Every structure is written in structure tokens, then in C-alpha cells.
């Protein structure tokens, strides 16, 4: 959840907002270790329910998200249902555990390609075109993350947009991401420069991957 002013500005200027609970357990092995554990349901529930209680009157918020990169655990299903019950006005989405779980109203993969399949075990990233028509699948598809804009990037961006326009059920995506997470440091002469991971003596670090 963002600073409260963000929603007011999105209401007034006009932007569709996905409001996302502060839950990410990416570094767990496996990713759902905490999210499939009922001992962690109370802490997770507060991050979801208190978001909804705060932001539910904002017209700019059109979709609730259960968080990010926390696998798919039973706690996700419980909290998916909680939202559906308390606020029927907004779809609920969540990408974890394969982007098309029972905890999402929208097929919301991250970095699924347009034409090329990436058949990872358990959590494949199918071509977005192929994903829509898998036996029994009926949901819309909007990428929660795509076209990773790191440095000299956005090659093949037009390929996504051609697909989006041709396929009714491909309804777009969210580019990753808006702004480089570089920080200002100062040299000997007091001149500013853009810094990334490791530049503060932080270790271990992931270097430029924050930009």
C-alpha cells in the first residue's frame, strides 16, 4: 500500500490502480513456506484486511492484489475469499505459484513472452496467447510485470502490443518498472553521482539490479 496521497491523485488525475498488500516472501525455500503455514495467517491477514479497510472508497483502485512472490499457499486462498466476501466491487489478483491459481481472478503472469513458451516445472510461463486457451481456462490475462526495462531495454515491446490488440482476452500489462532505484552519493569534491547495490558497503548485494 502506498502513501495515502497517491490514491487521491490517481482518483483526480485518472489512473487505474492495482492496490497490493505488503506481503513478499521471495527468499523463502520454497517460496510458499510461510504462506502455506497457518501460523502465519494472522500476520498475512492484517496486511490484506487493513489495506482494504483503508483504501476501499477510492475509485482509482480497481483491482486488489494479495502481494507478490510469496508462492501459492492456503493463506492466499483464505484471504482471496475474505476480499471477495467483503468487497464484491473489485476483482482480486495474485501471481504467486504460477499466475493462474485459485487465488486469482486474472491470469497475471510476470515476464511471460508473447509467442515463446517457458515451460518451467510446476510454474510454467506459457506464451500469453497460448495461456488463454489452455483447456478449461476462461479468465482475462493482464501481465502484472513485463518488458523488463533494465538499462538499454524494451526490445520487442511492439510484439506485446500487437498481441494485446489482436486478442480480446489479452488486456495489457504493467511494465517493470517506472523509475530506477538509484541513490545519490557524493565524491571528494562534493559532486553527486548515481549509486546502486554495494555502493554503501552493503553486502551481500545485487548491484545494478535495482535500476
Binding partner at 80 among Na ion, a copy of itself, none, C-beta below 5 to 8 Å by kind: none
Q: How far is the CB of 79 from a copy of itself (least distance, A)?
A: 28
Would you say 127 or 205 has its CB closer to a copy of itself?
127
**209 touching Na ion, by CB under 5 A:** yes
Q: How far is the CB of 118 from a copy of itself (least distance, A)?
A: 13
Tell me which stretch binds Na ion (CB under 5 A): 7-15, 87-95, 101-109, 163-171: 163-171
Binding partner at 127 among Na ion, a copy of itself, none, C-beta below 5 to 8 Å by kind: a copy of itself
- Render 17-54 in DSSP notation, one character per residue: EEEE-S---TTSSSTTTTTT-GGGHHHHHHHHHHHHHH
Q: How far is the CB of 131 from a copy of itself (least distance, A)?
A: 9
Distances (CA, A) of 6 to 12, 15, 62, 91, 145: 10, 10, 14, 20, 20
Is 72 labeled as ligand-binding? no
Binding partner at 134 among Na ion, a copy of itself, none, C-beta below 5 to 8 Å by kind: a copy of itself
Calpha distance 79→87 (Å, rounded): 12
Given candidates 25, 109, 170, 197, which one binds Na ion under the rule CB under 5 A? 170
Q: Which of 130, 134, 99 is nearest to 115 (CA)?
A: 130
Would you say 26 or 185 has its CB closer to Na ion?
26
Calpha distance 69→95 (Å, rounded): 7
Catalytic machinery residues: 69, 145
Cα distance from N-terminal residue to C-terminal residue, the chain: 21
CB 75 within 8 A of CB 36: yes
Q: Which of 59, 53, 51, 57 is nearest to 19 (CA)?
A: 51
Would you say 193 or 209 has its CB closer to Na ion?
209
Is 174 labeled as ligand-binding? no
Distances (CA, A) of 211 to 145, 150, 184, 195, 208: 15, 6, 13, 10, 6
Q: How far is the CB of 98 from a copy of itself (least distance, A)?
A: 16
Is 69 labeled as ligand-binding? yes
Point out the annotated binding site for substrate: 69, 145-148
Q: Which residues form the interface with Na ion (CB under 5 A)?
A: 164, 170, 209
Amino acid at each position: 500500500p502506498n502513501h495515502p496521497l497517491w490514491y487521491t491523485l490517481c482518483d483526480r488525475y485518472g489512473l487505474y490502480v492495482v492496490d497490493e498488500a505488503n506481503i513478499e516472501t521471495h527468499g523463502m525455500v520454497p517460496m510458499n513456506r510461510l504462506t502455506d503455514d497457518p501460523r502465519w495467517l494472522p500476520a498475512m491477514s492484517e496486511r490484506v484486511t487493513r489495506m482494504v479497510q483503508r483504501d476501499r472508497n477510492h475509485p482509482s483502485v480497481i483491482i486488489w492484489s494479495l502481494g507478490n512472490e510469496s508462492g501459492h499457499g492456503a493463506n492466499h486462498d483464505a484471504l482471496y475469499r475474505w476480499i471477495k466476501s467483503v468487497d464484491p466491487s473489485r476483482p482480486v489478483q495474485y501471481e504467486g505459484g504460477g499466475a493462474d491459481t485459485t487465488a486469482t481472478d486474472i491470469i497475471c503472469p510476470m515476464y511471460a513472452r508473447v509467442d515463446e513458451d517457458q515451460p518451467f516445472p510446476a510454474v510454467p510461463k506459457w506464451s500469453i496467447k497460448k495461456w488463454l486457451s489452455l483447456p478449461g481456462e476462461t479468465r482475462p490475462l493482464i501481465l502484472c510485470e513485463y518488458a523488463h526495462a533494465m538499462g538499454n531495454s524494451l526490445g520487442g515491446f511492439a510484439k506485446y502490443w500487437q498481441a494485446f490488440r489482436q486478442y480480446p482476452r489479452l488486456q495489457g500489462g504493467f511494465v517493470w518498472d517506472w523509475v530506477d532505484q538509484s541513490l545519490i552519493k557524493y565524491d571528494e569534491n562534493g559532486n553527486p553521482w548515481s549509486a546502486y547495490g554495494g555502493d554503501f558497503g552493503d553486502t551481500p548485494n545485487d548491484r545494478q539490479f535495482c535500476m
